[PDB]
Design a protein around this ligand. Structure first.
Ligand SMILES: Nc1nc2c(ncn2[C@@H]2O[C@H](COP(=O)(O)OP(=O)(O)OP(=O)(O)O)[C@@H](O)[C@H]2O)c(=O)[nH]1
Ligand SMILES: O=c1ccn([C@@H]2O[C@H](COP(=O)(O)OP(=O)(O)OP(=O)(O)O)[C@@H](O)[C@H]2O)c(=O)[nH]1
Lengths: 50, 1082, 38, 50, 50, 13
RNA sequence: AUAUAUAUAUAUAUAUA
RNA sequence: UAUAUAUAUAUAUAUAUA
């Protein structure tokens, strides 16, 4: 996989994440890790197969 | 911790009695564990008061040992007599070294018995042999004997380190035991009644010998330490220079394969050029005569090492040759008498048959350089030359004056010699003339001082009166500004890193080029420095008296001319016996303000002439002439390739042409490397001197043991980075004795690892070497506030002098001369500068530091209960630290190592991320008031005063700016544009870049903006809260290196620092200081 | 200003950023009334 | 009701409240709580029935 | 009169003051208090009457 | 005697 | 009863009745 | 349809250098 520490950094520069502002773009980064990449690839294949 | 384990075995060695006990003291951040610490410390004081053990108590209170951290270890020792000599005879097995007598050219410098070298008691000056360190010989022998019993049973590799440090100890111990260990006083000064039968230079020999045999690691080290310990008992004079001699020649033999380079704007590149080393046959005949002077001196294992290297001439074995040169300076200082050091220096032979055709060009080249340095700040009437009386007096060095004067400050009279204290007396009694400087002639001569070099003959130095500082401050502060914007003077190449500054040597080195490094035998007292150097400067102030029009820029330029008329003839005042000897000395005065700004003029303007006369035979094209006082080089680029005859016929034409100006010199030329400072470019790899005497100071200081134990460690980390590995188990053993404090009789208090290694005023040594570690755990940030609470102390001497009628008459006479107004924010701001300037006086700063440590003893005998909510540097890093996520990452070795003497755990960082490319300057912005005050007035205010000004009224900022001297339309353009409101956010941000250091003993070598450290640091970016952004990318860049030094592996961080925690940290960074920041947390 | 008690005692990050933005507004509104007095 | 912790948290992103800027949007979040919801449903009905 | 603690707090929102910069709208609020409106009402009436 | 130190050294170890 | 000049970098520390 | 400008704080101690 693309490294989960190297992807949220690039995802924090495509957005304009800035402090001293309550943005709705801070929540674009929650729940991104490699444990949930191997969990959604499995529950999509294994739900269609059963 | 490892240091606490060395503590509890040092106690079990020095106190081998059943009457001895050790009581550990503990503290903790928990309020529950503090009451666990109070009850434990109370019971070990009652049970060990009456003969009850502690093995039944450490199990019952094992909830505090494994969880709280150690504060100190108390030591009960009912030992009446020191048992040093009782365990010295166990190692006193060898034959005692008999001293030699025919090896020195003097009598007092020979190693004779002190009863025969000094006949009676009254004429015993210990200042020839005095180590002047605050340890003893009796404490050094316990520091080696502790090491020689811990490492007795060793494995088959570590045994040979122990064995080579034992046969070198039987040389020391069997000589000390023959005469007995000398007993010092309480001031660590060896008296006459104990040195009656001992040989002179036994303390300073066995102190310099113990420093050597705690550095013998390999068999290449043992052959040097065997032939220097035996010889330094005999000849104290010639030995340090005979071994250190061929390293000026041996730097010219090695080839260049791949070298560093610094380009013109000072930044580091890497070059790959291959340059041969071309030396004539008169270098190998000058090297054989440097290896026969080392054979007549007795040593025979060193020139066998050099002659086994001359058949190689390779850079792979040059770390052995740099080791031999560095072990030479560890034999101890060459201290001699004040009479024989001056009268052998102030003796020189002048000659009227000198080439006068060469002096009238040398005088003119000094004339055209002094005018070139001051044509701009004199044609435009500068704000610092118009205030030469004040800018020289308000910023006055307070080191010393010539004589001891009975100064009377109100009630408390004091015998001081400090220079700013003489100004306060003479401005009170009216015997102070501003425009008259006193004549140093046959009446009122110049007093003398001395400075001791570890291998050089003891030199003298000149202490001019204070009126020769006010005359010379403003002009020479304008000559140091031009020395930082010229490529020739070596104030330009002066940075933190050493590859950047001394790396312009290897820019023009090729096979058609010839480098030329010359060292004059003595730069003071040369023939070309008496008359043609003064009269070249006096002529330069005649053409500068026509450049301007003021009555005040001429008057300060008629004082800087008057100090050169008065020094053309001079006299030095040196006493001997009961007579005072006045010696005429018209040459240059090492000790003025002028002594470095005009040793870079007089040596550039000399070598610009001697490079002109050798161009009658060889036509070349010179590239750089860098000059640093005496030590200068000048690269010459030729037409043909440089051969073995053009090197010989230039070294015979620079030596002879310097002899035409009666300047005795040796002139060395090479094509590969020089020795400009003590930093040596050899084969494209910078090699350093690495000789710092740990256990021998050149002079006794104004410091206590708790501060001299820090400079024992600070002289070790510089010695280790430069390639002289002293054993860390001996340095740690020597800190456990210097930081010892005797509370009562028969009770010593020893601080733990957390008292010494923490980041506070009471810092001695870092936990792991070469790195600063700010401890973010709760038991270690809590004790930092316990040490930052008692650092603010008051001394009773400095407050009896600050309320006198003399010190107030000096501030009110200095505040009236500066400002033509009334305001008291400067009179209360000048008086806080001279109260801070009086710390150079010895009993003031000693009563500051002794009130630091005697208030620490009340904190160390008890568990600490001081709870305070102060924001520290170590509290910022407690909030950043849980948001770092480490991950192991691999990183290759790309860049090349340029310093081969570095240790392995530091060199691996340089080979991965690279040596430093450019000096990072990220100091934010200076405030807009300090660019408005420092441009008109010469008063530089502190940044805690400019914040006090801004928070005043709008009409009270304008009164303050007009007070200093700013015109009305300039302050009303400042105040009216409301840029005093923007300067609240540039003073408060100026304390953020001051906070954390990218420079240290070790951190200067690395490249912090490298594209291999920026690959591991993965921090998401937030546009606002700029102060937090700097401290995140700086602490992340420091955390990877502080991990990669300790363990040799690289980690890659990820700091998704949330927006709610940045604004909590943004106000923590603005509330470190003790002033009103607009944004606080709670 | 006058925020409910369910937000002040919260623990999510998005309800912690709101409190440390309404706090730096009242620490800036109190400061622009002091700058007038300057 | 929709939770007053999870509503001002949602309201403060549609407003884009900016720290270090005095907006007229920081006052839209006054008095939003579940106790003045059941006090305005009742005053609107009990005044109509009387 | 309008209370000067609440008149500034409304005027400092129509202007949209931003911290950490120097704007030309923090000078719109200087010299506004009840000691001055009660003193500029008299300097207009009593200078016309004499 | 020195039986106390070997029980006190390993307290720190 | 008490002697240690000047300059250049670098680091540590400090400012309050 | 619109996201400000600007390079040498001071003092003492300590080491490296001249
Ligand atoms: N008393 C004293 N002890 C020192 C001194 N310097 C170092 N020590 C320690 O004392 C040990 C050597 O014994 P001594 O120097 O005679 O000190 P002592 O055991 O207190 O005996 P006295 O000096 O007579 O008080 C060494 O191992 C050091 O740890 C000192 O100046 N005075
Ligand atoms: O403490 C010092 C050291 C040096 N200097 C100034 O630096 C000059 C050069 O200092 P050097 O150490 O190079 O002098 P030198 O040439 O006499 O040395 P040797 O060959 O005898 O080993 C000196 O002549 C003096 O002007 C000082 O002013 N103060």
């Amino acid at each position: 996989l693309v490294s989960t520490e190297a992807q949220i950094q690039k995802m924090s520069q495509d957005l304009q994440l800035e402090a001293l502002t309550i943005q709705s773009e801070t929540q674009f980064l929650t729940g991104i890790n490699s444990q949930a990449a191997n969990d959604c690839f499995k529950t999509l294949i294994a739900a269609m197969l059963s | 911790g490892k240091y606490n384990l060395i503590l509890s075995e040092y106690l079990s060695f020095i106190y081998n009695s059943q009457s001895a006990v050790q009581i550990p003291i503990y503290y903790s951040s928990n309020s529950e564990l503090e009451n666990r610490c109070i009850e434990f410390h109370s019971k070990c004081l009652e049970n060990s008061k009456n003969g009850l053990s502690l093995k039944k108590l450490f199990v019952e209170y094992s909830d505090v040992i494994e969880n709280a951290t150690l504060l100190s270890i108390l030591s009960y020792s009912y030992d009446k007599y020191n048992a040093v000599e009782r365990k010295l005879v166990k190692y006193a097995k060898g034959k005692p070294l008999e001293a030699d007598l025919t090896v020195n050219e003097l009598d007092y410098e020979n190693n004779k018995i002190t009863s025969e070298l000094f006949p009676t008691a009254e004429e015993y000056t210990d200042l020839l042999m005095d180590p002047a360190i605050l340890t003893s010989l009796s404490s050094n022998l316990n520091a080696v004997m502790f090491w020689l019993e811990k490492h007795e049973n060793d494995v088959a590799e570590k045994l040979k380190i122990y064995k080579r440090r034992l046969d070198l100890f039987t040389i020391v111990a069997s000589t000390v035991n023959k005469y007995g260990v000398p007993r010092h006083n309480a001031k660590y000064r060896y008296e006459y009644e104990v040195m009656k039968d001992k040989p002179y230079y036994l303390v300073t020999w066995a102190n310099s010998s113990i420093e050597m045999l705690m550095s013998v690691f390999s068999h290449e080290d043992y052959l040097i330490a065997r032939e220097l310990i035996v010889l330094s008992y005999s000849n104290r004079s010639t030995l340090a220079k005979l071994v250190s001699s061929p390293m000026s020649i041996l730097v010219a033999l090695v080839d260049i394969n791949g070298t560093f380079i610094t380009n013109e704007e000072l930044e580091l590149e890497f070059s790959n050029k291959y340059v041969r080393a071309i030396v004539p046959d008169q270098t190998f005949d000058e090297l054989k005569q440097m290896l026969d002077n080392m054979r007549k001196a007795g040593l025979t294992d060193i020139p066998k090492m050099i002659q086994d290297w001359l058949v190689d001439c390779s850079i792979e074995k040059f770390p052995l040759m740099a080791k031999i040169y560095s072990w030479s300076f560890h034999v101890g200082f060459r201290k001699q008498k004040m009479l024989d050091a001056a009268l052998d220096q102030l003796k020189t032979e002048y000659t009227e048959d000198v080439d006068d055709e060469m002096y009238r060009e040398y005088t003119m080249l000094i004339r055209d350089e002094v005018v070139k340095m001051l044509e701009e700040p004199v044609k435009h009437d500068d704000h610092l030359l118009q205030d030469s009386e004040l800018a020289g007096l308000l910023s006055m060095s307070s080191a010393s004056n010539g004589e001891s004067r009975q100064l009377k400050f109100g009630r408390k009279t004091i015998f001081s010699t400090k220079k700013n204290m003489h100004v306060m007396d003479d401005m009170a009694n009216g015997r102070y003339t501003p425009g008259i400087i006193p004549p140093v002639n046959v009446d009122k001569p110049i007093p003398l001082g001395r400075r001791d070099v570890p291998g050089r003959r003891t030199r003298i130095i000149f202490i001019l009166p204070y009126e020769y500082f006010i005359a010379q401050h403003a002009v020479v502060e304008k000559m140091l500004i031009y020395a930082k914007h010229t490529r020739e003077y070596a104030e330009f190449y002066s940075q933190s890193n050493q590859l950047l500054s001394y790396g312009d040597v290897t820019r023009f080195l090729s096979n058609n080029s010839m480098v030329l490094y010359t060292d004059v035998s003595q730069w003071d007292s040369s023939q070309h420095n008496t008359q043609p150097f003064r009269k070249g400067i006096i002529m330069g102030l005649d053409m500068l008296a026509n450049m301007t029009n003021d009555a005040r820029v001429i008057q300060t330029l008629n004082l800087y001319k008057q100090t050169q008329i008065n020094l053309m003839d001079s006299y030095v005042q040196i006493p001997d016996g009961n007579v005072i000897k006045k010696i005429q000395y018209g040459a240059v005065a090492s000790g003025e303000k002028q002594t470095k700004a005009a040793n870079s003029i007089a040596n550039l303007a000399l070598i610009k002439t001697v490079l002109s006369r050798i161009s009658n035979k060889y036509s070349f094209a010179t590239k750089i002439i860098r000059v640093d006082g005496d030590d200068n080089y000048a690269v010459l680029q030729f037409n043909t390739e440089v051969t073995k005859q053009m090197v010989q016929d230039v070294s015979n034409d620079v030596r002879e042409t310097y002899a035409r100006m009666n300047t005795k010199v040796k002139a060395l030329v090479s094509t590969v490397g020089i020795e400009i400072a003590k930093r040596y470019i050899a084969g494209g790899k910078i090699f350093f001197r690495a000789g710092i005497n740990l256990l021998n100071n050149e002079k006794k200081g104004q410091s206590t043991q708790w501060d001299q134990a820090a400079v024992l460690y600070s002289n070790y980390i510089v010695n280790r980075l430069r390639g002289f590995e002293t054993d860390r188990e001996f340095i740690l053993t020597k800190i456990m004795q210097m930081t010892s404090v005797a509370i009562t009789g028969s009770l010593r208090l020893f601080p733990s690892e957390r008292v010494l290694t923490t980041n506070s005023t009471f810092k001695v040594f870092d936990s792991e070497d070469f790195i600063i570690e700010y401890g973010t755990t709760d038991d270690e940030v809590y004790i930092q506030r316990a040490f930052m609470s008692l650092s603010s102390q008051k001394s009773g001497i400095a407050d009896e002098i600050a309320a006198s009628s003399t010190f107030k008459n000096y501030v009110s006479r200095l505040s009236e001369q500066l400002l033509f107004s009334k305001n008291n924010i400067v009179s209360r701001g000048i008086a806080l500068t001279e109260k801070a300037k009086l710390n150079s006086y010895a009993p003031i700063s000693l009563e500051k530091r002794r009130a630091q440590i005697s208030a620490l003893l009340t904190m160390l005998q008890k568990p600490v209960t001081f709870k305070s909510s102060k924001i520290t540097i170590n509290d910022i890093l407690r909030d950043i630290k849980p948001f770092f996520t480490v991950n192991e990452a691999h990183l290759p070795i790309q860049y090349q190592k340029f310093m081969p003497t570095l240790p392995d755990n530091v060199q691996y960082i340089i080979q991965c991320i690279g040596s430093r490319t450019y000096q990072i300057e990220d100091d934010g912005s200076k405030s807009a008031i300090s660019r408005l005050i420092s441009k008109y007035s010469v008063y530089k205010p502190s940044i805690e005063e400019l914040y006090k000004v801004i928070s005043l009224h709008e009409n009270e900022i304008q009164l303050y700016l007009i007070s200093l001297g700013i015109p009305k339309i300039d302050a009303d353009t400042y105040v009216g544009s409301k840029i005093y409101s923007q300067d609240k956010y540039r003073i408060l941000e100026s304390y953020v870049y001051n906070l954390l250091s990218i420079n240290y003993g070790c951190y200067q070598l690395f490249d912090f903006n490298s594209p291999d450290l920026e690959k591991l640091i993965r921090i998401p970016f937030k546009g606002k809260i700029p102060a937090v952004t700097f401290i995140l990318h700086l602490y992340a860049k420091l955390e990877v290196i502080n991990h990669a030094i300790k363990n040799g592996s690289w980690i890659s961080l990820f700091c998704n620092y949330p927006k709610s925690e940045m604004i909590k940290l943004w106000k923590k960074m603005w509330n470190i200081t003790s002033l009103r920041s607009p944004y606080t947390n709670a | 200003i006058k925020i409910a008690d369910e937000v002040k005692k919260s623990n999510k990050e998005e309800s912690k950023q709101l409190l440390e933005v309404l706090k730096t507004k009242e620490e800036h509104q109190k400061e622009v009334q002091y700058e007038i007095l300057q």
